[PDB]
A and B are shown apart, each in its own frame.
Chain A
Amino acid sequence: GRMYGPGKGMSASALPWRRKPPTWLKIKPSDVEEHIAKLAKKGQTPSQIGVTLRDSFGVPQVKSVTGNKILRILKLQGLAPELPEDLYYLIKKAVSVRKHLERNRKDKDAKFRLILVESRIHRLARYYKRTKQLPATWKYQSATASALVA
């Protein structure tokens, strides 16, 4: 039932049975890895690469074509982000709400939602420190959060 809301939604991508598809496809393992390193250099997140691939170009999935996932390829090349994308987009959301909330102080609903996103940042950071995807002793501060994004 999600997490924070009461909503209980079943919507998801359901991946196919066969692997290394498709028979119709060709190109190469090598040429796809060049395209990913090109678009990462353009400045584009691991989610946004695989959207750009399956939409315009071929490849349904990169894990089908190459052995590796997209973030595995970026981290091998050394064109990976500093912090992971889900933690990035939660912090950027929290900074956006703090601009709104210190303009409009009487908005109680915005004050409620800022607790929920910043609570999620703290617990999701505690994951990423355990897996060593973040430097040790890395912590969220609402003073220094805005410069940390961009």
Chain B
Amino acid sequence: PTEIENEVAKCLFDIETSSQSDLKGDVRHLVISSVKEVEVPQGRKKAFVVFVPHAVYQKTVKKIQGRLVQELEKKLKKHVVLVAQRTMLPLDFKRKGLKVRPRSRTLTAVQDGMLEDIVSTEIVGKRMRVRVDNTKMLKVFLDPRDKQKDNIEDKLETFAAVYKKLTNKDAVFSFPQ
């Protein structure tokens, strides 16, 4: 299970056998945990969000990142964005043992770990707004250099949807003039 996790798992061993396949050998190390069907408002296509075991996502799978995303985009249609499963840790933590609760595991550090991972360009600057209505519209200024793929302009919409599905928080991206 589930249905979409099988569909994404079906695509991976197709990327193995593609006559040559540049990154086919490398992936074998790669494995997948889970998915989430997230649809952008008025989205042209639903964009799959693929979770990654943390150990796999470190040395093993983030070496390329970009090449893999474009292959699944043309193969499966849609969009795709690819993140690590960070465990989190609840505040009650002391119960059931444990002491340090290292701050990599805390909720601010996980949600910061999402943004670095989802955009995938890096972020030149990050800023948050607080409206008179009283809702916190965050902003994430990506680097203007290396705009590259036209998809980035189309995919700039869907990060607001992907960020809202995980963290329940409003984010607007864009590139500084």
Interface on A for B, CB 8 Å cutoff?
A: 17-18
Main secondary structure of the interface of B (DSSP, over half): strand
Nearest chain B CB to A1 CB, angstrom units = 33
Q: State whether the Cβ of B144 lies closer than 8 Å to any Cβ in chain A.
A: no
For the complex, what is the distance from the CA of A18 to the CA of B125, rounded to whole Å? 9
For the complex, what is the distance from the CA of A13 to the CA of B124, rounded to whole Å? 20
A-B pair count, CB < 8 Å, reads 3
For the complex, what is the distance from the CA of A18 to the CA of B122, rounded to whole Å? 9
Interface on B for A, CB 8 Å cutoff?
A: 122, 124-125
Closest to A23 in B: B122
Closest to B122 in A: A18
For the complex, what is the distance from the CA of A17 to the CA of B125, rounded to whole Å? 8
Q: Which 3 A-B pairs have the closest CB atoms?
A: A17-B125, A18-B122, A17-B124
For the complex, what is the distance from the CA of A60 to the CA of B58, rounded to whole Å? 23
For the complex, what is the distance from the CA of A17 to the CA of B127, rounded to whole Å? 13
- Determine the chain A residues whose CB is within 8 A of the CB of B124 once the complex forms: 17
For the complex, what is the distance from the CA of A18 to the CA of B141, rounded to whole Å? 13
Closest to B126 in A: A17
